[PDB]
C-alpha cells in the first residue's frame, strides 16, 4: 500500500542517516580534529518520536510531535559504550533528556526508545536541562542540570522573567532516576558541576553564582545540598573570550599533569552573545588552585556552527577520555545540533601548558608573536 | 553595442530567473511541503525598477535604485492568478507595496510593472509596511498595514523611537486605493487584519495591543474605524514558542470545522528575538473562542531561511486556498526574501487537531512523546 | 621523518592559499564588482605566526598562537604596491595591526614577517583597532585608530564598560612608528579619520562624537591634538541606513567633483545592529559642505559577508585610487574577513551624483521608481 | 559486534538506494522525459546475492559474487506492478534473466529474491540475453532471447567466434518456465520478438535475420518454431541511424492510429558501433506494411548514458503502455545499466506521425528545415 | 616580476598537488579498497620537466615539452620507501620510464629529478613501455620491459605494423641500468615478467606468446636470455575477462598458500577492446600448477577509471606487499593516470580461495548463486 511504503521510507531513510559513517576534517590546528557531520541532529530522534504509525489515526501520515533540536548534551562512558545524555528540544520548546548511544564515539549515535523520565522536585519546574553527567566514586551517576521556572513575581504581562535551580538527580542504570532536593543557594546558580572524588571527605561542586566565575563549594551532603563557602577558581577578564560570563562544561578530566577542565566564555558583540569554549588546568594537590590558563578560546564556531536557532555559540557539557588517552568532545552548535571533536589527554595538556598565557593587551599579545616569529624564523633559515 | 548587448542580457537574465520552475523539498514533516527557491527576492523586482536604461543619462549602465528586500507580503487569489502584495525595500531602507503576480502559486511570480500608490491619510506615514488583504464580503478588498512615524517626542539624537498605527486602505482593482483613516486606539497597535465576514452586523478586526496576545475588535464604520472592546483571542505563554509577542498573520481560512489561523511568535535568545509561525483554531459560532491549540510552531527556519538582513526570522502575511482544498502559505524568511509551502485544508486541520496541545512542561512534554512511542512499539511488533 | 614532512604540507598549503587568483563576480550592479574570495582570512597569517615549528618544544605540531579574524584594516597604495593595514584578532580577543602587500590589489596578499609595533602612548591601551592610514601632504603617514581601555569606574562585577580615544601614530615607513598624545576631547571619539590635506592651514580631523553624525574638527598641532570647535558634516536620519549611528570609514578620496567618501552606517533590528556602507560628496572649496547624498546604502552584506563572528555587518576603514581611475575598495565582513570590491572613480562619483536623494518616505520612495519605470517603459516602447 | 554492525551497514545502505524517488529531467524535446536516476545498476543486486554474510564462512565480509551491469530488460506489466526482466551481467561475464518490479514504474525496483532459472534447450547455451517479453493472446508470457554458444568452425586459438539462436521459454508466473525448442531457421536470427496476437491464425515474429532489416515471420507452431516465409518490415539505409544493423526492440504498442514499434539502429564511426533507439509505426490491418517512419533517432545517449562497459549505447527491449496512456520506456544505456523515460501513447503517435520522414540527403534536410523556420518566422512576427 | 611571481605561483601549486592527501573510498566490496584521487596524473611530472624557467629563453612562460600521460607502472619497495617505475608518455607520443616515490604509498608520490636513462640493445627501440621491476634473489632489480619497433615486413605506407621483443635491464640503485640481450624467442612476447626466485637452479619469466594464453619458460643466462620450452599457466577461455588476451603484470607475491598473482583480461566489444584485472593462485611446490582461480575480474574500470586516451581499461604492472600483509594495488586507468588500491594479504587470498570457480555458462552462474542466496536467506530468518 502506498501508506506502508512511505512508513518504509521513513525508516529506511532514518536508518541511512543513523549509520553514516563521520569524516575527520583534515584542516585543523593539531589541537583538536573536526568531523565532517554533527552526531546528532533533530532528524537523528526516532521515527517512532515524531509519526504516529497507524494509519487509522494518522492517515496522512504527519508528525505528530516536532523536535528542534538536540543540543547541550552531557556524556558517559558507559558499559564499553559512548553515551550522550541529550537535550533535546521540542517543537513546543520545552526540553527534555534522553540517553543517545555509539559504539565508536563518533557516529552511529542512536537514542534509547524511550527518554528520560526524571521526577519532579518539590517544587516543579517548566523546563529542564544541560545535564553534565558525574560517576562519582559514592557509587552513584550524578545529573546536575537547570531547572527553570517562571519568576512569578513579574511585572504584568513580563511572561519571560524566570529563575532557575542546580537540579540533583542521580541513577545507577540512566533509566530509574531519583530526585534530590535541588541545590539550596544565596546566589542563583547554573552550570553546577559535580567533581568527581570526595574532598576533604566533601561533594564538591563547581558553581557559577549570578558573578566572579567559576566557583567551588564544598557540600556535606548531596541529598541535602546546601552552598556555604564558596570560592571563585576561574574569573571573568575584561577584553578576554571570558568578559560577560564563563562556566564549567562537563566535570574535568583527571591527568598526572592535574585535572584538565573545559568551559564556554562569553562576550557581548553587536550581534548579541557569543559563546565559545576554553579549557583551563587546576592542581591535583588543591583542585581549587589554577595551574594552566592557555590565552584565549579552544574552540570558536567554525563554518556550518556558526548558525542556528542561537548563532555565534559553541557549548559543551560532556567528554569522554579512553583508557589510551583518547579524548572525545561532544559539543553544541547554536544551540541547533551535536557535534564531535577528537584529541588526546597528552595534546590538551600540553595545549593548556604551552599556549602563552593571556597578557592581557595588544602590546603584549605582539610581543609574545614576535619572540615566536623570531624563534621561527631563525629556525626555517 | 556593447550598451545595448548589456541591456539585453539584464534583460535576459532577468527573464530566466523569473521563469525558473519550482521544485518541492521532498523531505518533509507531511505537514508542509517547503520548495527549492523562493517565490521573490530582490532580483526578483524588474530591471526597468533598477536601472534607468537610457545610454544618454546612465552611459555606464549602474543602477540608480536599489533593491534591497522582498518580504512580509499579503496575498490573494484575484481573477484565477495567485496574487502576493509585496512588502518592497529599497536600499534606501523605505518600504513601499508591490502586486507580483503567478498563475501557478509556486513560480513564475511577476512584479506588476507599477508598484501600489497609497495615498497619505491626513498624518503622513514614513515607513508603510506588512499589508493583510481581506476580500470583505462588503465587496471591497481591504489592506490593513502598518504606518510608522517618528515618535517627534524623544530625547535628543533619539532617531529611533517610533509610532505606529494600523493604516486601512481599500480597493476593487488593487490599482486605484481610497485611503480610510488610520485605526483610533487607546493601546499601540500592529498586525492588525480585517475578518472577511461582519459579526454581530459589524466589521472585525484581528488587533495586537501594546498586551495579552491576539485580540479582537468589533468595530462599527470602517470608514472611521475605532477599537473600543477589546478581547484576546489567543495568549502569550511563558516558555512557549510566542513567550515575547504574536501577532495574526494573513486573515483566517474559514473550514467546515472553524476558523483556520496562521500566526507569528516571538521569543528572546542570545541573538535576539526568534520569530517562527503557529496555527490555531476557532468557532466558527464564536469566532473568538479557541477550539485548536496545537502545541509548538509550524514552522521555523530551515536551512537558507535562517539567515537574511533580520535572521532567525519567519513572518507570514499572506495565504491562498484553492477551492480544491489546496493552500498556497507566503512566508518571508529573515525580513529578506519570499518563500511558499502548500499544504491542504484537510492536513492543517488535521495538524491543529492532532498535535498534542502544549501541557506547559518538560515533564508534560515527555509524558505524550512517551504515550505516543509506545502505542508505536506496539504497532511496530 | 613524519614531523618535517607535516611542516613541509604546512607551508605548502598555506602558498597555495596565498596565491590563489581572485575572480570578478560577474553578476553585479554596475557601481561596485566583488570578488569570489576574500583578499584575507585569518588562515593567511603566516604559518611561522601559529605554529612553533621547532620538533624539540612543539612534537605535536599544533597551534600556539590562534588567530581568529583579520578585519577592519586601512590602506594605502605604498611604493607600488597595494598595501591593507590589517586589524588582526588573535584568540585571545586582542588586536594588533600588521601590514599586508599584494602586487595587484585584488589577490597575493599576504603580510610582512612582523606585525605592528605600535609604543604606547602615556595611558596604556587594552585593544587598539581599525586604523586609517593617510599619507598627509606634511610627509608623514598617520595612522588615527581607537584605542579602548576598561572603564576602572564601573559598578562590581561589570568587566564590560570601556572607554575609548582617538590614538594617533605617524611613520615614514610603517616599521618605526611614533607615538603622539591621544586625541584630547570633551566627547568620546571613534571612526576619527585625519583629511590628507591642510585646512586653513590646519590639519583637519573626521570625527564621530557620542551625537550628530561624523564631524568636521580643525587641528592646529597633530602632535598635541585636541578638539575644540566641531561641526557635523552628514547627519544621522530616522528610518535611514544610518539612523542610530555612522562613521567615516578611509579618508575620503579627491575627485575634480569633490571629495568622495565612504563612510558606514548602522541601525537596529530584531537581530542586533545592522552595518553598511553608504557614500557621500563634499566640495572642494569647503570640504565641510555636502554636495552629494545618494540615498540608502552603498554595499550590504550579500551572502558569506552575512555570517561571521558580528554578523550583519560591512565595515571600511580603507581604499585605493590608482592613478587611472582604479578603487579598490577594502571592506571587511561580520567582523571575520577582509573583501575587495573595485570600481572607478568616474563610476562611483556618477553613482553619487545620479542617484536619487532619500526623500525620506515611502511616498517620496515610490514616486522616484514611478518616474524612472515611466522614463524606461517609453523607451522600451 | 563489528561483523553484525558492518552487515546491518550493507543492508541499510541498500534499502536507501532501493528507495530513492526518482526525478524527472526538466529539460526535454517534448516527447520524452528522462529521469535524473538509472532505474537499476549493478548495486541495485540484493546484498544477499553478492555477500555471504555469514561471518564463520566470510569473517572479512567480503563480496562472493561479483555483479557487473543490469541492462537490455524486458518489461512487462504484471498484476498490477512494473516488471522489468533484468539482464543481469556478473563479474564472471555471463548473464542471466532476473524479475525486477516496482509499485510506480520509474523507482523503488527491486529484485525477487530468486533470479530466473531458465531449463536449457537439447543443446546447452553458453550465454543467455535480452528477453523480449510478450503476453500473447494464447494466454502464455513468452519470452524470446538469444542463446550464444562458440562457433565449433572456428580455428585453433580462436575463442571469439560465436553462434547465437532465438530462444524461446514460455510461462504462467514468470518463475517455473518451460523451454522450447530454439528457433530453427536457415539465416543467423536475433532480436527475435513476438508479436501479441495472432496473425492469419499464426503465431508472427519480428526477425533480424543476417540482412535487409527487421524482419516478419509467421509461424505455425510456437512449440516447434521455424521461419520459412520472412518479409523485411523496417530496411537499413545508408547514412542513417541504422546503417549497419538495425533490430527490434520490445514487442509493439497497438494503438488505435496502428502497431507503434521502438527499435535500434547502429552506425559505425571511428569509436566503433553507435547504438540509437527509432521509431516507427505500421497497419492495423497489416502489420507488415509501414505507415510511420519519423526521421533519424527518437533517442540517442545523453550524459551519463554516454559511458559504460559498451559506450555510445542506447538500447530497449522493454516498455510499458498503461490503459491511461501513460508510457514507461525501459533503455539500458552503455550495457551498464537501467534507465526509464516517459511519454504517452499520444505523444509518441504524434511524434512518429509528424516529425517529417527523412529525404535521405543533406539538401531534402535543408529543405525541411527551411520551411519549418519559414512558418515560425512568420507566426512570430 | 610578474615572470617571476609566475614561476613562484607554478611550482607552488605543483606542491599542492604533490602533498594532497589522499582519502579511501567508502563504498568497497570487501576485497580492495579505491581511493578518491590518482596517484600519479601528467601534471605530477614536475615543472621544470615541462618549462624552461629562464625569462631569456622563455619569456611567454610555455611549456616546452608536454607530458601527456602516467601509466602501467612497475613497482618496487625500496629503502623504506614506495616506488613506481612510471610509464611516462610525452605529448609527442613517445614513452619513457622515470621514477616516483612516496613515504606511504597511497599520496605524495614525486617523481625523481631525472627520469631513467636506458642504454639501447644492439638494435634500438622506438618505444619503451610497461616494465615490472623483480629483485630478484641473485642480488640484481630486473626490469623487464617492451621494446617496439617499426615492422620492416610492412608495405610502403603501412607506418602502423610493429614488432615488440622483451627488453631485460638491470640495476642495483634504479639510476645506473645496464641493458642485457632482448629476449630470443620463436614467437612474438609481450608482458613478460621475472619470477622472483630460481626454479631448478634457473631464471623464470611469465611470457604471453603470440597463443593459449599465460606461459612459463626457465631461462639458464638471463645475460643471453632464450626461451626455449614454455608451458601455459593460465588459459583464455571463451566468453571470460580473458577471452581474447591475457597477460601477467607484475611479478606475483609469495604467501603461506602459494604464488599469488594479478593479471589482465581482454575481450572485444561494440566500442573496441575492453581490459580488466583478474587473479589467480600458483603452488608454492610447482608453481606451474594452479591452486586458485577466483572467477570473473577481480577489478573493472569504476567511474573516472572509464575515460582516457584508450578507454575501458585498467592495467598493472605493479604492487607491493608490506611485511605486515597490507598491499598497495598500483594500477592505470585507460592508459592515463595511475591509481592505488589497497588490501591485504589474507583478504587477497581470501578472495582467490573462496570465490566460486568459473563453471562457463549462464546455467552454471545461476546456480552458484541461488546456492548462495539459499544460505543467506536460512541465515537472515
Same mark, same amino acid.
Given at each position: 500500500?502506498?501508506? $506502508?511504503?512511505?512508513?518504509? +521510507?521513513?525508516?529506511?531513510?532514518?536508518?541511512?542517516?543513523?549509520?553514516?559513517?563521520?569524516?575527520?576534517?583534515?584542516?585543523?590546528?593539531?589541537?583538536?580534529?573536526?568531523?565532517?557531520?554533527?552526531?546528532?541532529?533533530?532528524? &537523528?530522534?526516532?521515527?517512532?518520536?515524531?509519526?504516529?504509525?497507524?494509519?487509522? *489515526?494518522?492517515?496522512?501520515?504527519?508528525? /505528530?510531535?516536532?523536535?528542534? =533540536?538536540?543540543?547541550?548534551?552531557?556524556?558517559?562512558?558507559?558499559?564499553?559504550?559512548?553515551?550522550?545524555?541529550?537535550?533535546?528540544?521540542?517543537?513546543?520548546?520545552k526540553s527534555f533528556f534522553?540517553?543517545?548511544? #555509539?559504539?565508536?564515539?563518533?557516529?552511529?549515535?542512536?537514542?534509547?526508545?524511550?527518554?528520560? *523520565?526524571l521526577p519532579e522536585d518539590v517544587v516543579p519546574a517548566t523546563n529542564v536541562y544541560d545535564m553534565?553527567?558525574?560517576?562519582?566514586?559514592?557509587?552513584? %551517576?550524578?545529573? %546536575?542540570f537547570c531547572a527553570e521556572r517562571h519568576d512569578? $513575581? =513579574?511585572?504584568?504581562?513580563?511572561? !519571560? #522573567?524566570a529563575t532557575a535551580t542546580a537540579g540533583i538527580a542521580?541513577?545507577?542504570?540512566?533509566?530509574?532516576?531519583?530526585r534530590?532536593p535541588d541545590l539550596?543557594?544565596? #546566589?542563583?546558580?547554573?552550570?553546577?558541576?559535580?567533581?568527581?572524588?570526595?574532598?576533604?571527605?566533601?561533594?564538591?561542586?563547581?558553581?557559577?553564582?549570578?558573578?566572579?566565575?567559576?566557583?567551588?563549594?564544598?557540600?556535606?551532603?548531596?541529598?541535602? =545540598?546546601?552552598?556555604?563557602?564558596?570560592?571563585?577558581?576561574?574569573?571573568?577578564?575584561? &577584553?578576554?573570550?571570558?568578559?560577560?560570563?564563563?562556566?564549567?562544561?562537563?566535570?574535568?578530566?583527571?591527568?598526572?599533569?592535574?585535572?584538565? &577542565?573545559?568551559? &564556554?566564555?562569553?562576550?557581548?558583540?553587536?550581534?548579541?552573545?557569543?559563546?565559545?569554549?576554553?579549557?583551563?588546568?587546576? !592542581?591535583?594537590?588543591?583542585?581549587?588552585?589554577?595551574?594552566?590558563?592557555?590565552?584565549?578560546?579552544?574552540?570558536?564556531?567554525?563554518?556550518?556552527? /556558526?548558525?542556528?536557532?542561537?548563532? $555565534?555559540?559553541?557549548?559543551?557539557?560532556?567528554?569522554?577520555?579512553?583508557?589510551?588517552?583518547?579524548?572525545?568532545?561532544?559539543?553544541?552548535?547554536?544551540?541547533? /545540533?551535536?557535534?564531535?571533536?577528537?584529541?588526546?589527554?597528552?595534546?590538551?595538556?600540553?595545549?593548556?601548558?604551552? *599556549?602563552?598565557?593571556?597578557?592581557?593587551?595588544?602590546?603584549?599579545?605582539?610581543? %609574545?608573536? +614576535?619572540?615566536?616569529?623570531?624563534?621561527?624564523?631563525?629556525?626555517?633559515?
Open positions: 500500500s502506498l501508506f $506502508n511504503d512511505k512508513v518504509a +521510507k521513513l525508516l529506511a531513510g532514518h536508518e541511512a542517516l543513523l549509520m553514516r559513517k563521520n569524516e575527520p576534517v583534515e584542516e585543523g590546528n593539531g589541537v583538536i580534529t573536526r568531523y565532517r557531520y554533527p552526531v546528532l541532529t533533530a532528524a &537523528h530522534t526516532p521515527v517512532f518520536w515524531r509519526y504516529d504509525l497507524n494509519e487509522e *489515526t494518522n492517515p496522512f501520515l504527519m508528525e /505528530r510531535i516536532g523536535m528542534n =533540536a538536540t543540543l547541550n548534551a552531557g556524556a558517559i562512558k558507559w558499559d564499553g559504550k559512548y553515551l550522550m545524555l541529550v537535550r533535546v528540544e521540542g517543537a513546543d520548546r534522553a540517553v543517545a548511544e #555509539s559504539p565508536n564515539g563518533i557516529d552511529n549515535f542512536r537514542f534509547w526508545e524511550y527518554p528520560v *523520565t553534565r553527567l558525574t560517576a562519582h566514586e559514592d557509587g552513584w %551517576i550524578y545529573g %546536575i512569578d $513575581n =513579574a511585572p504584568i504581562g513580563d511572561l !519571560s #522573567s542521580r541513577t545507577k542504570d540512566l533509566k530509574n532516576w531519583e534530590l539550596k543557594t544565596k #546566589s542563583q546558580q547554573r552550570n553546577v558541576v559535580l567533581h568527581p572524588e570526595f574532598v576533604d571527605g566533601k561533594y564538591a561542586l563547581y558553581t557559577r553564582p549570578q558573578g566572579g566565575g567559576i566557583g567551588w563549594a564544598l557540600i556535606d551532603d548531596i541529598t541535602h =545540598a546546601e552552598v556555604g563557602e564558596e570560592k571563585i577558581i576561574d574569573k571573568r577578564y575584561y &577584553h578576554t573570550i571570558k568578559e560577560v560570563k564563563n562556566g564549567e562544561g562537563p566535570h574535568p578530566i583527571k591527568t598526572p599533569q592535574g585535572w584538565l &577542565h573545559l568551559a &564556554h566564555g562569553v562576550r557581548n558583540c553587536a550581534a548579541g552573545l557569543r559563546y565559545v569554549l576554553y579549557m583551563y588546568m587546576t !592542581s591535583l594537590d588543591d583542585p581549587t588552585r589554577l595551574i594552566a590558563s592557555p590565552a584565549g578560546y579552544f574552540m570558536a564556531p567554525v563554518g556550518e556552527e /556558526r548558525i542556528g536557532d542561537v548563532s $555565534n555559540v559553541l557549548f559543551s557539557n560532556g567528554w569522554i577520555a579512553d583508557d589510551d588517552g583518547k579524548v572525545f568532545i561532544y559539543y553544541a552548535s547554536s544551540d541547533t /545540533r551535536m557535534h564531535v571533536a577528537t584529541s588526546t589527554i597528552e595534546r590538551l595538556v600540553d595545549y593548556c601548558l604551552h *599556549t602563552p598565557q593571556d597578557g592581557f593587551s595588544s602590546s603584549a599579545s605582539v610581543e %609574545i608573536l +614576535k619572540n615566536l616569529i623570531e624563534r621561527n624564523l631563525r629556525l626555517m633559515k
